[PDB]
Nucleic acid binder design. Structure first.
Ligand SMILES: [Mg+2]
Ligand SMILES: [Mg+2]
Ligand SMILES: [Mg+2]
Ligand SMILES: [Mg+2]
Ligand SMILES: [Mg+2]
Ligand SMILES: [Mg+2]
Ligand SMILES: [Mg+2]
Ligand SMILES: [Mg+2]
Ligand SMILES: [Mg+2]
Ligand SMILES: [Mg+2]
Ligand SMILES: [Mg+2]
Ligand SMILES: [Mg+2]
Ligand SMILES: [Mg+2]
Ligand SMILES: [Mg+2]
Ligand SMILES: [Mg+2]
Ligand SMILES: [Mg+2]
Ligand SMILES: [Mg+2]
Ligand SMILES: [Mg+2]
Ligand SMILES: [Mg+2]
Ligand SMILES: [Mg+2]
Ligand SMILES: [Mg+2]
Ligand SMILES: [Mg+2]
Ligand SMILES: [Mg+2]
Ligand SMILES: [Mg+2]
Ligand SMILES: [Mg+2]
Ligand SMILES: [Mg+2]
Ligand SMILES: [Mg+2]
Ligand SMILES: [Mg+2]
Ligand SMILES: [Mg+2]
Ligand SMILES: [Mg+2]
Ligand SMILES: [Mg+2]
Ligand SMILES: [Mg+2]
Ligand SMILES: [Mg+2]
Ligand SMILES: [Mg+2]
Ligand SMILES: [Mg+2]
Ligand SMILES: [Mg+2]
Ligand SMILES: [Mg+2]
Ligand SMILES: [Mg+2]
Ligand SMILES: [Mg+2]
Ligand SMILES: [Mg+2]
Ligand SMILES: [Mg+2]
Ligand SMILES: [Mg+2]
Ligand SMILES: [Mg+2]
Ligand SMILES: [Mg+2]
Ligand SMILES: [Mg+2]
Ligand SMILES: [Mg+2]
Ligand SMILES: [Mg+2]
Ligand SMILES: [Mg+2]
Ligand SMILES: [Mg+2]
Ligand SMILES: [Mg+2]
Ligand SMILES: [Mg+2]
Ligand SMILES: [Mg+2]
Ligand SMILES: [Mg+2]
Ligand SMILES: [Mg+2]
Ligand SMILES: [Mg+2]
Ligand SMILES: [Mg+2]
Ligand SMILES: [Mg+2]
Ligand SMILES: [Mg+2]
Ligand SMILES: [Mg+2]
Ligand SMILES: [Mg+2]
Ligand SMILES: [Mg+2]
Ligand SMILES: [Mg+2]
Ligand SMILES: [Mg+2]
Ligand SMILES: [Mg+2]
Ligand SMILES: [Mg+2]
Ligand SMILES: [Mg+2]
Ligand SMILES: [Mg+2]
Ligand SMILES: [Mg+2]
Ligand SMILES: [Mg+2]
Ligand SMILES: [Mg+2]
Ligand SMILES: [Mg+2]
Ligand SMILES: [Mg+2]
Ligand SMILES: [Mg+2]
Ligand SMILES: [Mg+2]
Ligand SMILES: [Mg+2]
Ligand SMILES: [Mg+2]
Ligand SMILES: [Mg+2]
Ligand SMILES: [Mg+2]
Ligand SMILES: [Mg+2]
Ligand SMILES: [Mg+2]
Ligand SMILES: [Mg+2]
Ligand SMILES: [Mg+2]
Ligand SMILES: [Mg+2]
Ligand SMILES: [Mg+2]
Ligand SMILES: [Mg+2]
Ligand SMILES: [Mg+2]
Ligand SMILES: [Mg+2]
Ligand SMILES: [Mg+2]
Ligand SMILES: [Mg+2]
Ligand SMILES: [Mg+2]
Ligand SMILES: [Mg+2]
Ligand SMILES: [Mg+2]
Ligand SMILES: [Mg+2]
Ligand SMILES: [Mg+2]
Ligand SMILES: [Mg+2]
Ligand SMILES: [Mg+2]
Ligand SMILES: [Mg+2]
Ligand SMILES: [Mg+2]
Ligand SMILES: [Mg+2]
Ligand SMILES: [Mg+2]
Ligand SMILES: [Mg+2]
Ligand SMILES: [Mg+2]
Ligand SMILES: [Mg+2]
Ligand SMILES: [Mg+2]
Ligand SMILES: [Mg+2]
Ligand SMILES: [Mg+2]
Ligand SMILES: [Mg+2]
Ligand SMILES: [Mg+2]
Ligand SMILES: [Mg+2]
Lengths: 210, 147
RNA sequence: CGCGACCUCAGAUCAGACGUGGCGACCCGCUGAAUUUAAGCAUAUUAGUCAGCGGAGGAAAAGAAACUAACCAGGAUUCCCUCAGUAACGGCGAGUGAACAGGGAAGAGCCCAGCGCCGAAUCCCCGCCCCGCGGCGGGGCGCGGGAAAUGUGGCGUACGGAAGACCCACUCCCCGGCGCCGGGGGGCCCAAGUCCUUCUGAUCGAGGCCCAGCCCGUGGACGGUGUGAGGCCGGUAGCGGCCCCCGGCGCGCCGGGCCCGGGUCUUCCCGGAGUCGGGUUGCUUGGGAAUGCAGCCCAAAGCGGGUGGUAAACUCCAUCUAAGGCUAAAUACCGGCACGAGACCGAUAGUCAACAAGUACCGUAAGGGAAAGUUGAAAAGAACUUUGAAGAGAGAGUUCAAGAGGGCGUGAAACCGUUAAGAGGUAAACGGGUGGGGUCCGCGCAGUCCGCCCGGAGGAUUCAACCCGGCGGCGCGGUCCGGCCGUGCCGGCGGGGCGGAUCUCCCGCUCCCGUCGGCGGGGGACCGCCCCCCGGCCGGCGACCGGCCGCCGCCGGGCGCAUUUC
RNA sequence: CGGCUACCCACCCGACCCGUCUUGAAACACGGACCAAGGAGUCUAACACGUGCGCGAGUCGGGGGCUACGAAAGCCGCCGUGGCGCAAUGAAGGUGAAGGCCGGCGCCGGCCGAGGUGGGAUCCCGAGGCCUUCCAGUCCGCCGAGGGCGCACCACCGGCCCGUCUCGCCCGCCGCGCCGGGGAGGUGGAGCACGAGCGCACGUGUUAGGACCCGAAAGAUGGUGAACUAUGCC
RNA sequence: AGGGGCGAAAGACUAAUCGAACCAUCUAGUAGCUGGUUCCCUCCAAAGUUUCCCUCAGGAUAGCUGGCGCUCUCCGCAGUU
RNA sequence: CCGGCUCGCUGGUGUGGAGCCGGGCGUGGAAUGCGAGUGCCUAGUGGGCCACUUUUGGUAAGCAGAACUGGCGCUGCGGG
RNA sequence: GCGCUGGAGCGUCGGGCCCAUACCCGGCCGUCGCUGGCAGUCGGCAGAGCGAGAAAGAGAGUGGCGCGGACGCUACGCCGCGACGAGUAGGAGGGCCGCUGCGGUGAGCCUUGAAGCCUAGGGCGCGGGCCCGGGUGGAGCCGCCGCAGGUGCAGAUCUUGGUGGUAGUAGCAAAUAUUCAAACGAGAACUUUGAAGGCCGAAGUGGAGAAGGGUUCCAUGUGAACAGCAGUUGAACAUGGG
RNA sequence: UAGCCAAAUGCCUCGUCAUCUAAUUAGUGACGCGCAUGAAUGGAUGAACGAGAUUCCCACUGUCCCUACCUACUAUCCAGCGAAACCACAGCCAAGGGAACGGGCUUGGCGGAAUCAGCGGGGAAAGAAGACCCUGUUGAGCUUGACUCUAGUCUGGCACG
RNA sequence: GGCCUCACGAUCCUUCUGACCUUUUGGGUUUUAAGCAGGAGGUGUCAGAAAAGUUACCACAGGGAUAACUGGCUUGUGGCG
RNA sequence: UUGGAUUGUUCACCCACUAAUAGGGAACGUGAGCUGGGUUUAGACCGUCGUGAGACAGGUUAGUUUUACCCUACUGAUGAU
């Protein structure tokens, strides 16, 4: 028996929902448990970064988020081979690797390679045997200065390019954006049909002139 | 709180505020939206027109990202950039015009609704309305399309 | 005919092992309704839910794309928010109802078959010797036995691999036996009043404990002790102490195991079949010309196959490589062990059960299933006398208290007896109005005082007015001097922090032959705001004052001397 | 001596036993011996309206992270991803919210610039006047004929946006095409026309949940009974 | 052995239960139909009527009612003439 | 009422009509009474009955069905 | 109804009288309205008012002794005028009405006596209810400001428990029947013995089994409870056997 | 059709006739255009039999005229022991009105403790939320030419083949 | 459209008609399908469920809103004057 | 204001006597006073209707009649002022 005026509602409570209901009374306890495990992990890997390995620059797929840059799964094999880093040693030195990533661009690949070069420059590698240093190990004086870093290593920030004010040209003032948009829409919609009309006209005119 | 509710003042009254002739039974009119077509016809026609029946085409796999296109108006166009940009452009003597990249702000389409101040601009957007573009041209400016 | 192999199948109280069943909160696989809603009801809804069956673990399952997308692309699985009560399904009615992207928790990758290359280079069992053995292992000796060519092991798996050649290039990887060093499981302990009076039956009640404002306090949580205790006791706080067992580390030897790597060029190889897929039928899903699963029939191909949410044909694209397998983490927990807590319940409440409770008790059985806490601080549980056979009384005694006497704290109402008072033939009882009688109350029974004035008896160290000291108020002083603030401002040849979508010498990165042309970072300048320092105005000090002077009031000490004052 | 009130008794007047259903109840209508204890619109989610607080075209850390009571509290801001709002319309392809005036050849430069009318609380101006003996006279106020700019809001007339219908003439080019854009006049819209929302809390109403409390005749799933009795056999 | 058994047939018996046994669960099954619905005071104050419904013991919707206000005053309105 | 514009509607006719501005007239143009107007949320109700007069079916009914008004319901009090 | 007939009847009427919560005046309570009035307690830093039929200043400037003055004002407060007061279902507001717990607060109460309970006691408030007095009690309890709810009973053939009238009532009536003397014993219609009279009448009221029950079988002691009276008796209870 | 009947089958019907009695809606035997008998949904008949349903007759008797008396056990009283149903408060009638049959209300009639043994007039006496009738969008047993399906069964195709 | 007062029908589905109409979802073409608008197929219980009986073996919640018993108002009819 | 035949009868008809064999009410007086003959459970058989389960104001047959000790009333019996 609905009232005078109001919405029509379709609540999803017709099942036995009380039998399966989850309550968050353990939310602070779970937060503390996560925090203690995180700190225990951090002290377990004494010189290694708390956030773990380094992940590459990645922009989101969909149209809604193609203007934003996020964190990636791992560095692509093509990026690694350009940087001269082996796929089996990258994980050992703390570089995220996933072989499924492709590279259909060039600036993104270069940006990842540059980041990998910067990471190798910033990385401090302890000797495998402390008594016997080797070629790839860092110096003794910089060994004592190593320490963990909170948060992600080299966090990915959405860098913005700003261009200074310019003088507007006559060609820009004569550009018809709305007309160009509509005409481009029409051309995209009618591209194929015009082609088949042209083919039909040519294949029919040739019979007339033959 | 239950202290301030009506049930505290209903004690001593037999029907508890529900009537004596027609008692407060369980479901006198069915469950939920029952009988919208039969005995709730007047309510569903006087308050929910168009409720019954289908209309339009069916889009099976609909994804909001494809149709995602937020819009902004020319009155708020200057609000995206800082005040010092506008005052320096107004004070500028060489005629250089600021470039407003609305995409970086987070709007793809620009619609021309409000009055646009007399000041050259370069609006770099993804889509433009006809009136928006003609207002920019009339006030003096450029429109740049980006993908 | 027989002997000797291989192959299929038997019998073993043969030697050595394993499974059986139970709990089952959480999890995996299957089966699986009707109540109910739709105001009836058949599709739907309830609902892949209850019931039923099987199988585990400390988590399970899933899991590293035959993926998501159509963008400038992301990149295992899992969980939270969001997408979203949307796309969509629905007698398009009731109702049902995801997924992508995004932000987080966590984050870890891999291994076979196949193709190949290495004398099967592999593995199991029994006998003997040595070592430690309460996770039966390591080394050595067996012309000891067996598995396996109907394929074990090494290289090697979609991210390419292998081999050859040419360059560069590393040895310290890994266990396990023994052995020396600085995070838990329990045990025993650690501060301070029974201080002086005072109630009490007992104090943990009350007063005091100085000019060490009793003592301790990193210990004033709690409980017990004859009340209500920081200091009587256990504990409590402590990065406090001692003892035993074990653990992840950081060293040493000892035995063996492997003598292994990267880049370039050349040559070869590369894949999982009654499986996909198609037709039909049934169930499921939001999946709609059929999302997923299953039965039947047909049943393949390799520049092939799958996916690209409307069936089909043609044609370019995008993305993976199905029919093999492993894997912690973030995640679930009303079963179990040990714990902590509560704006909960307080014995008809809260679990059915605070107690000899799933006990007594009922049903043949499946099953059903209670009522039931309070002596007292301490039993000090009533010696002894008296009537009666005794139940049980009358004395006496214990206890502060038997008005606490063994189902005994407190002890209401309905109900009953007795005593006292009143009334009584219109059932009782009730509202208004009085009258009478009782109960106690008014500690009533010579009835309030409070100010001013007059008069009489008195008694004071006594009023006013002056002096000194102190305190306070007051715009005092139209405009005293000094400080402080402004949710006020101005100036700045001042010293700074924050922000900017305002501009502009150095460093790092990529293309080109130290240079011309690019990106990121740093630096400099500019603007806005704010902090501090200096100077000049306005206002306030009544959310925010100091020292003088002026007035007034108050307090104390003097002079005051009784026609004043009390 | 006073004490209405609370104990009893006597008299006068009135006086049918409560609850519930019903048009009609004291009813020959049902429930009711008496007493004690328990006992019935609560909670979750959604929506709407109104009220309180904060911020405000913004608002919200609800998820995550950093630091006895405290499982609290504070902080994040390059954790505002995301929800709501700031833009509507169309099934969709999509589109997406004032104009007027002046000079030159529909196009170019400049100017005015973001509706009008009626009612509109309040505000602004002021023909004069508010007396102490009388005249001229100023300053601070006060009242006031009349005249205005008009809050919010209501009504109407306009204007603009999207879909649609009709009549139409023009404009643009990288690809002059079954291309794209523009006008006027009607019409449909949950629109604009100089914001009003977001978060939290409270009350009310409705809904789905056991849903104010008690109540079926029924249906389904899984198990137990032939020790009575029905029948067959030994 | 339960929608089953058995019945010289009465819907008879099937553990005091038979025109579908008993126990537990779904299940606090649904009820437009009965019963009940707990403290005081103050203020306001009804309808059994229209329309529609497999609607007639009920609802939705108007009407009646209450609450919260808001815009104005010291022109407007009227169960009247 | 008096002037002046607009009109793409209709026209002999600055014809018709409508719209928009400007100007003027307060004895506030029957009596009486009364402060009005407007917007949200919403319970309960949705079985009625009686009476004067009007009136249908039925002979008639404490019958059944209508219209106005007033009551009972929801309401006590004096009289019957 | 009693009764009434020179009405206490009938028809027309005249005075007088009687009383409702109706009407008029008055007191008190509450509601509503005037959205009324009060910061002006402006005092030796002074001058006491804006009730009055008439729109606006007890307004300012230029020239001709005695040291004094009541309450107020929790502005969510106080005060002044008028009108009104019914009410089912239903709605709203005020509760210094009531219960439980939580955060604050009362240098709160309390073994020199809290909660609870009873009371022919004193009262207050319209009312929800509340504060004191007297008796038992021995260990906790309340007021104010906010918060929260499993927060108020007369009923529901309500749930649990207890208790009345009936009521010392119905009944203790199926199968013929007991009497006498003694013993134990405190007590005898009911036990035991002896005698008499009876019944079951060999398909039994006899003697023994199966199923079923499980110590009921035997002896002693008790007479607390049960054997619907009582019991010296028991298939009751406690001891030991079998 | 053969048979049969106011039958256990006949509304009209207590049909008409005869008999059975003083009197018979009963019984029996007949008659039949029989609302609506009837042939293995069996008709007609029929010895014996029936705790089957009927009418008459002889004997018999308290069934009755018409009631009386006796016995045993109760009821009655006492001793002991001792419940339950039910109970708004309770209980004297006439009329009136009313919710249309009151114990309570109004007017009258009038009423006097505690009680014992009977009785069945009233308490619209007690049990049981009427089983009859109706409503419910409440069901269950059963039936079918109701709707929708289903085991099973017959047939065809596909594979074994 | 019939001189007027009547002569007729929602959702969903199907069918037909109309546009050089839109989508068919990674792109293009063509069938197909889905859309917009206007008609028709239908509900006569006509604001529109898809619907045969019996129960004396019956059951449940209720109803004196509703009959058969009694009781009230009238006496048509019956009786009487 | 009667005794009887018939029928469960209320009604009805007949026989006989008498004086007359008049009519009615009291919840169609009177079931905790009786009976159960008929209506009207569940078992059955006949006829008619229906395919059927079943129905028949058509007939026939067998088919549990519970309680008073309470108040009042009435009959008697103590007593009471
Ligand atoms: Mg409603
Ligand atoms: Mg992380
Ligand atoms: Mg009420
Ligand atoms: Mg009611
Ligand atoms: Mg209702
Ligand atoms: Mg409700
Ligand atoms: Mg309908
Ligand atoms: Mg063996
Ligand atoms: Mg197992
Ligand atoms: Mg339903
Ligand atoms: Mg229903
Ligand atoms: Mg149904
Ligand atoms: Mg389904
Ligand atoms: Mg399903
Ligand atoms: Mg399934
Ligand atoms: Mg299960
Ligand atoms: Mg696993
Ligand atoms: Mg893979
Ligand atoms: Mg994913
Ligand atoms: Mg579903
Ligand atoms: Mg995601
Ligand atoms: Mg191999
Ligand atoms: Mg203690
Ligand atoms: Mg002390
Ligand atoms: Mg302590
Ligand atoms: Mg102490
Ligand atoms: Mg100590
Ligand atoms: Mg299934
Ligand atoms: Mg294609
Ligand atoms: Mg694979
Ligand atoms: Mg795989
Ligand atoms: Mg696995
Ligand atoms: Mg805690
Ligand atoms: Mg207890
Ligand atoms: Mg208790
Ligand atoms: Mg309990
Ligand atoms: Mg108890
Ligand atoms: Mg006790
Ligand atoms: Mg107790
Ligand atoms: Mg005591
Ligand atoms: Mg005591
Ligand atoms: Mg005690
Ligand atoms: Mg006691
Ligand atoms: Mg006496
Ligand atoms: Mg009287
Ligand atoms: Mg009732
Ligand atoms: Mg009713
Ligand atoms: Mg009635
Ligand atoms: Mg009543
Ligand atoms: Mg009556
Ligand atoms: Mg009755
Ligand atoms: Mg009833
Ligand atoms: Mg009763
Ligand atoms: Mg209670
Ligand atoms: Mg609001
Ligand atoms: Mg949303
Ligand atoms: Mg609402
Ligand atoms: Mg609710
Ligand atoms: Mg139930
Ligand atoms: Mg069913
Ligand atoms: Mg047997
Ligand atoms: Mg079977
Ligand atoms: Mg039968
Ligand atoms: Mg059944
Ligand atoms: Mg319930
Ligand atoms: Mg009123
Ligand atoms: Mg109904
Ligand atoms: Mg209500
Ligand atoms: Mg009703
Ligand atoms: Mg009605
Ligand atoms: Mg009528
Ligand atoms: Mg009513
Ligand atoms: Mg009224
Ligand atoms: Mg009245
Ligand atoms: Mg009269
Ligand atoms: Mg009132
Ligand atoms: Mg509580
Ligand atoms: Mg008393
Ligand atoms: Mg004690
Ligand atoms: Mg009670
Ligand atoms: Mg007796
Ligand atoms: Mg006997
Ligand atoms: Mg024997
Ligand atoms: Mg014996
Ligand atoms: Mg006895
Ligand atoms: Mg005879
Ligand atoms: Mg005959
Ligand atoms: Mg026949
Ligand atoms: Mg026949
Ligand atoms: Mg006796
Ligand atoms: Mg009386
Ligand atoms: Mg009687
Ligand atoms: Mg019943
Ligand atoms: Mg009933
Ligand atoms: Mg109905
Ligand atoms: Mg059914
Ligand atoms: Mg059919
Ligand atoms: Mg429909
Ligand atoms: Mg497609
Ligand atoms: Mg029958
Ligand atoms: Mg009658
Ligand atoms: Mg007549
Ligand atoms: Mg006779
Ligand atoms: Mg009778
Ligand atoms: Mg009877
Ligand atoms: Mg009788
Ligand atoms: Mg009979
Ligand atoms: Mg029968
Ligand atoms: Mg007797």
């Amino acid at each position: 028996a609905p009232s005078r005026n109001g919405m029509i509602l379709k609540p999803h409570f017709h099942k036995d929902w009380q039998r399966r209901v989850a309550t968050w009374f353990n939310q602070p306890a779970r937060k503390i448990r996560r925090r203690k495990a995180r700190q225990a992990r951090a002290r377990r890997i004494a010189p290694r970064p708390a956030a773990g390995p380094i992940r590459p620059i990645v922009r989101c797929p969909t149209v809604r988020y193609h203007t934003k840059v996020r964190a990636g799964r791992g560095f692509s094999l093509e990026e690694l081979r350009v940087a001269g880093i082996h796929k089996k040693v990258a994980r050992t030195i703390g570089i995220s690797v996933d072989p499924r990533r492709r590279n259909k661009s060039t600036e993104s690949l270069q940006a990842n390679v540059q980041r990998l070069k910067e990471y190798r420059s910033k990385l401090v590698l302890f000797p495998r045997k402390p008594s016997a240093p080797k070629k790839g190990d860092s110096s003794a004086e910089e060994l004592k200065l190593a320490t963990q870093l909170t948060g992600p290593v080299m966090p990915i920030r959405n860098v913005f390019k700003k261009e200074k004010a310019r003088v507007i040209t006559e060609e820009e003032k004569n550009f018809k954006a709305f007309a160009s948009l509509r005409m481009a829409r029409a051309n995209a919609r009618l591209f194929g049909i015009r082609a088949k009309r042209a083919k039909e006209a040519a294949e029919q005119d040739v019979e007339k002139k033959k | 709180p239950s202290r301030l509710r009506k049930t505290r003042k209903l004690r001593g009254h037999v029907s508890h505020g529900h009537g004596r002739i027609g008692k407060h039974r369980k479901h006198p009119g069915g469950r939920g939206n029952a009988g919208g077509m039969h005995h709730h016809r007047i309510n569903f026609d006087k308050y929910h027109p168009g409720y019954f029946g289908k209309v339009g085409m069916r889009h099976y796999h609909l994804k909001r990202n494809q149709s995602f296109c937020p819009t902004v108006n020319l009155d708020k166009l200057w609000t995206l950039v800082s005040e010092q940009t506008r005052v320096n452009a107004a004070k500028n003597k060489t005629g250089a015009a600021p470039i407003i990249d609305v995409v970086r702000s987070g709007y793809y389409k620009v619609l021309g609704k409000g009055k646009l101040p007399k000041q050259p601009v370069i609006v770099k957007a993804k889509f433009f309305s006809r009136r928006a573009e003609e207002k920019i041209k009339g006030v003096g400016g450029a429109c740049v399309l980006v993908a």
